[PDB]
Paper text:
In addition to the dimerization role, the inserted domain was found to serve as a binding platform for the SD repeats before and after glycosylation. A long positive tract along the inserted domain stabilizes the binding of the glycosylated SD repeats to SdgB by offsetting the negative charge clustered in the tandem SD repeats.
Two glycosyltransferases (GTases), SdgB and SdgA, are responsible for the glycosylation of S. aureus SDR proteins such as ClfA and ClfB.
Numbering used by the authors:
A (entry chain C), C (entry chain A): 0 to 499
B (entry chain G): 3 to 8
D (entry chain D): 1 to 8
Write the structure that this text describes.
């Protein structure tokens, strides 16, 4: 009996929800229960993106499954440059400041090739052109080596249709697209499977078909990216058990618990609640709010998405002459990282040695860099990018900041406490209120009170005896979220969630 | 052309 | 060493040029020299059309070649209807007055299937539709069973690209199209062959690649459909020998030998004369006209495209009650068949038991029918359509008429003589005056002199003893075009044409 | 009718 956790994909940089799924696989692994991640969307880099966190046996990707590459490993690395010049007798012009080549034969421009790496061992894509230099086709290579998809283009490099191969070059899926409000949308899918040909109108229906091939009597599904996974489970028979896992606040205006509409990402889930065995949310308070709001139609339970282990890296080895503040947060607007650059702008007047290190990725990267540059803070505020392992960055961190206006839990908050780093955070739903006890492991601050935020941060900098105190309190709070107590809650859940 | 790459 | 007679395709009704090719294939067989016809254009009904005249080993088609379908025969028919209902659990809804079904999956519309026969043995095409009832793909089946080509459609059923399969379903060629003056034209072709990938800009370059793969040292090519084959041979190396064969007058206005431009269908050939080992025409006079015009740049030789056997079917079993005149010619303007209908109008008042039977097909058939009604000649002039065997129709024919203004030889003229049917023909370039000796086996008449036409045809009607004499002269002249006579010329030609 | 666009 297999436990399947169903999300969308794993990016090159892990999101919160993807980390929660990996956390859960590791907890099931340690208690001995079978679990696999299930990934729905086409991602020819998945095998690479998974490598730091899980093994090729711990996940099934739906396109891998129909493409006959599920559990397939990296290939013998193949030298495309040499094949094209030595075997094909093409001529290559390298493009400046890239891993790209233009490809000519017979005084014609044939192809544009883009590699992932500088040793040109990972071919990424190849564009093909006709006699007039229209880009008629794009070939997309899986990082394991095989050609994964060919996209046919119409008019202004618009996506008309895509073909998906097994590693031998047999076609296994076809997708046909139409543009609606400037974006391409699937209108038809053809899948060649089990010696038959199957027809679908969209990726939800293909999803549902995939789930039904995976399922054996006794398996259990967790629906973790609900804007895609719930529409899929809504098309599968009720005899397949599934649990809905919320990862964020559930309503649009969190201040109208009773009347605010459900977020768009959770609507299909809430509009078909009786399909689901239960809802799992991270925090106590969200349990109480969701159960009242759905009038107890199905069970609601709280299991934190994050846990603490004991740390085998240094903890609180501080540089005494400089203060290091940290933010572990996406470069995205609801994190409101601009407020922390403003906080630093004020603080440098009193702490000449202060630094703020912002670990993340996202869209606000440019605006935030331009804000730091407009204030001359380039020597005090660093956008460090995404690090896959933050362990050494916590070692000398004095404080963590959270200026977000909505959270489901905040894994970063629990990671900070587990590494001894007190946290100062706006008192927002959900997470901070349960993880921070003011004056014990940090401080809770009224949402968007930049004035109070400065005062409490400065007080802790002014008083390193406090910061030590809250650091011991931090390791204490984190111990309540131990690997062991989460296993207990998970094991009890899986033992009771099926009917008997 | 710059339309050659993506 | 193999001899290759390169045309373009084979239709339902055998044409002149196609019969010239098949005649030549039969002559090389009779003398023991290997010979095959080469067809260029994609035609998934070609194995049907050819079955009546040659065998499957007597020809190579280019698309069959790269689709690995050369020398493949029919499969035993697949019961698609039964596979769709019993194995796929689709629902079929017959389209009334058609061999067509609409195909549904549980009330969802997927496919429109058109069979060729009313027995549903020969699937012709299948259209695929998306969730909005767009026609995104058309599957075209070869009459032999397998799926030959899929066409991807965009906007208003415009062709965007085509994929061509071997009989196993592997893709072997890809064509990409752009629209120019409202018609699709090939802008790129990708061929998968000999484990490599080849790129072309148009069908002519693909043709030239095909000629190169066919060639083995000592082979000889004959270019018979020069509007397509000359451009192809212009892109092949001079080391591949090719003879150009003209089948019509060579210039747009035959009365201006020195000055008229070459017909469009020969331009590309005459502009690259030194590529060709020789030019072959059918008649003496055209040899001398052409060798002058090209200033003797390459050899010009005459070998008639037609030959006679002796006939085992009956000859000159005439009805003593009526006069049967015949015309054996396309219903096409240069044959000027309206003039023979005028002739009958004038003769019917003098010899009322007359009949004119016109065998052929073409665009003029409506004007010719309207002309017959205008004159009230429905009882006397019979548009008989195209008959694939004429032997019985010549048995009771008194006289054959030719009113054409332009011929290369006229296979129908020699065929008439060989059945002992004397001929009255305008004296035009090229053929009639080499095939008819006035007062021996017919009469020649100044071009478009319709009075002289009436006079001489009346003369032969008045003198059945003359018609008997001209009949026997016809069997005699036909002997000068015997199979043995033609073999003797082809053998000498093939022995001398290659270099040494 | 619109259903005639399904053929050819
Ligand atoms: O440089 C970084 C920045 C962030 N993270 C991780 O990204 C996740 C984000 O967690 P959170 O619950 O805060 O997710 P979010 O609220 O951003 O969706 C955390 O586990 C971080 O450890 C990381 O590994 N490296
Ligand atoms: O009902 C018909 C009419 C014509 N033909 C054939 O079509 C050919 C016409 O060739 P020809 O050179 O006479 O004229 P072209 O069409 O080449 O100008 C001849 O061989 C005829 O035997 C035929 O088989 N059946
Ligand atoms: C913006 C937001 O709410 N972030 C939540 C985060 O708090 C939570 O820890 C993570 C894993 O459950 O999922 C994210 O969606
Ligand atoms: C209209 C015309 O020119 N007809 C010729 C015909 O005389 C000749 O017998 C045949 C085969 O050579 O080719 C045709 O094109
Ligand atoms: C594609 O890449 C090249 C650099 O390798 C760049 O010049 C061009 O602008 C890029 N086009 C895009 C981003 O579409
Ligand atoms: C024909 O197709 C049209 C849509 O184009 C549809 O409305 C109609 O129901 C169809 N009729 C039949 C007979 O299938
Ligand atoms: C297509 O074929 C079907 C069946 O013969 C017919 O109902 C329909 O009108 C045709 N439409 C055309 C002319 O394309």
């Amino acid at each position: 009996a297999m436990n399947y956790f169903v999300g969308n994909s794993l990016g090159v940089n892990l999101t919160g929800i993807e980390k929660a799924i990996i956390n859960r696989l590791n907890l099931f692994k340690e208690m001995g229960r079978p679990a696999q991640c299930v990934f729905l969307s086409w991602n020819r880099y998945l095998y690479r993106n998974a490598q730091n966190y899980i093994t090729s046996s711990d996940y099934i990707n739906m396109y891998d499954f129909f493409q006959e590459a599920t559990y397939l490993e990296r290939n013998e690395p193949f030298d495309w440059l040499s094949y094209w010049t030595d075997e094909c007798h093409y001529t290559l012009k390298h493009v400046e400041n890239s891993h790209d080549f233009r490809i000519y034969d017979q005084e014609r421009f044939l192809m544009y090739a883009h590699f992932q790496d500088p040793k040109y061992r990972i071919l990424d894509y190849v564009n093909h052109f006709d006699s007039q230099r229209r880009k008629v086709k794009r070939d997309f290579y899986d990082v394991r080596g095989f050609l994964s998809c060919s996209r046919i283009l119409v008019d202004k490099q618009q996506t008309l249709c895509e073909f998906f191969y097994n590693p031998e070059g047999d076609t296994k899926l076809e997708k046909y697209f139409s543009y609606k409000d400037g974006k391409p949308e699937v209108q038809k899918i053809i899948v060649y499977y089990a010696n038959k040909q199957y027809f679908f109108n969209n990726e939800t229906e293909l999803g549902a078909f995939f789930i039904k091939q995976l399922y054996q009597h006794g398996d259990l599904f967790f629906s973790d990216r609900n804007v895609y996974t719930a529409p899929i489970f809504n098309l599968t028979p009720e005899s397949i058990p599934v649990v809905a896992v919320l990862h964020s606040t559930h309503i649009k205006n969190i201040d109208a618990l009773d009347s605010s509409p459900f977020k768009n990402v959770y609507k299909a889930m809430f509009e078909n609640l009786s399909r689901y065995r239960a809802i799992i949310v991270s925090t106590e308070q969200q349990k109480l709010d969701v159960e009242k709001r759905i009038n107890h139609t199905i069970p609601v339970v709280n299991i934190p998405v994050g846990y603490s282990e004991t740390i085998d890296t240094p903890v609180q080895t501080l540089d005494q002459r400089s203060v290091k503040l940290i933010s572990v947060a996406r470069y995205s607007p609801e994190k409101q990282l601009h407020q922390q650059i403003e906080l630093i702008k004020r603080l440098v007047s009193y702490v000449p040695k202060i630094e703020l290190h912002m670990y993340g990725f996202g869209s606000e990267s440019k605006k935030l860099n331009e804000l730091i540059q407009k204030y001359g803070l380039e020597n005090h505020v660093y956008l460090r990018g995404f690090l896959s392992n933050l362990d050494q960055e916590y070692s000398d961190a004095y404080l963590s900041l959270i200026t977000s206006n909505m959270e489901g839990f905040s894994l970063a908050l629990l990671e900070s406490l587990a590494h001894g780093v007190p946290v100062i955070s706006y008192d927002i739903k959900y997470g901070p209120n349960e993880l921070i006890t003011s004056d014990f492991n940090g401080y809770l601050i009224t949402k968007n009170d930049e004035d109070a935020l400065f005062d409490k941060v400065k007080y802790v900098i002014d008083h390193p005896e406090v910061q030590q105190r809250l650091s011991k309190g931090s390791l204490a709070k984190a111990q309540q979220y131990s690997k062991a107590s989460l296993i207990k809650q998970w094991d009890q859940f899986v033992r009771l969630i099926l009917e008997h | 052309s710059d339309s050659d790459s993506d």
